[PDB]
Amino acid sequence: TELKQADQIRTWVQSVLDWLHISRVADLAVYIGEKENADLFIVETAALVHDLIDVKLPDTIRLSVSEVYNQLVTFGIGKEDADRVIHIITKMSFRDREKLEGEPLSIEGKVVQDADRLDAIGAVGIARAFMFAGAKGHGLYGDDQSAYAHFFHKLLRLIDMMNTDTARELAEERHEFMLQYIRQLEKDIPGID
Amino acid sequence: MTELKQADQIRTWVQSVLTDWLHISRVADLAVYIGEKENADLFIVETAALVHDLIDVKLPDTIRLSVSEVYNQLVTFGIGKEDADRVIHIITKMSPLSIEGKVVQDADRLDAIGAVGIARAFMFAGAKGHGLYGDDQSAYAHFFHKLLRLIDMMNTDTARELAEERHEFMLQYIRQLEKDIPGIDAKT
Ligand code: NI
C-alpha cells in the first residue's frame, strides 16, 4: 500500500515540476533516515512535497498547505502520517527559520533539512550556485551577488549547520572538494580575490 | 611606449561597449602569456583578443558591432592600417588561421575548460533554461559532447601544456558528480 502511495505522490509532484533537485533530495533523505532511525515513509513524502508551498514560487504553480494536505488524504494516507508531513513542511518554510537552527524539527524533519543542505554543497552545490547566477543574471565573481561571494557568505558555512551525525560525516568530503575547486579557480583566474 | 598607450585605449573602449568584460580580460592576459612563449606578435595578439567578441553573434544587437565599425575605431585610435588589417583578418576567420589567431583561439578554449570552464557552462545552462543533467541540452551533456574534446583542438604546445592540468581537474569534477549523483549518466 505504501509503495503505491509513494508512486502516486512521485507522479503528482513530477507533473508539477525543479524535479531533478527534489528527486535527488528524496533519495538522500531516505539514506540518512535509515542511519538515523527516522520514519522512512514520512521522510520520503515530506521531501517530495516541501517545495510545493515555497514562497519563491510563482502564483501559478504554488500550492497552499491545505491543498497539499487534502491531496495526501485523497491519496489515502492516514491522519497521523498526514499531520506529521504537514509539521515538517511548515517548520521548514517560515521566514528566517535559520534563527531557530532546525531545533523545532522532529528527527524526520532534521533528516529532510540535512539532505537539502547537502545538495547545496560539493560538486552538485557548485553546479547549482552557478546555474542560479546564470538564471538571475549575476556574475561569476567580483560582486556581492556573484556566485563566488556566495561560497564564502553561505556555502562554506553549511557543514557547521548540519543536524544529524550522518549528514556531518557525509559533508566532510563535499566541503573538502569545494576548497579544492576554489583553489583551482584562483589559479585559473589570477586576481579573482 | 606607444604600444602601451594604444592598448590602454582599446581596453577602455571595449569595457565601455560591453555595458562580458571579465571573460575578455582574462583571455587577453592568457593570450599575451602564450604569445610570449610562442614568439608571436604580442600587440596583434592582445588587440585581436580584446576585440574579437565585439562582432560575435552571441552579444545582443544593442551592443554588437560590424567589422568596419571595429576597423574604423582602431584606425582612429592610431593603429596602422597594416596592423588593423591583420586584426580584422584574424577576427573574421574566427567568426586557415595565423600564428596570432591560433594563440587567441587557444586562449578562448582554455577559458572554457578547468574550474572557470565548469563555472561558465553551468551559468549558461541557467541562462537558457537547461538542466544540470537529463538531456542533450543539459550542462552535463555539454561536457561529454564538447568541453572534454577541447584539449585535442589546441594549436600551440604552450596552450597544450597549460590545458593538461585544466583538463584533468575537469575529469576530477565529473568523477565527483558521478559519486554524488549515482546514475547521473543514464538519468532522464
Ligand atoms: Ni529545496
Ligand code: NI
Ligand atoms: Ni570568447
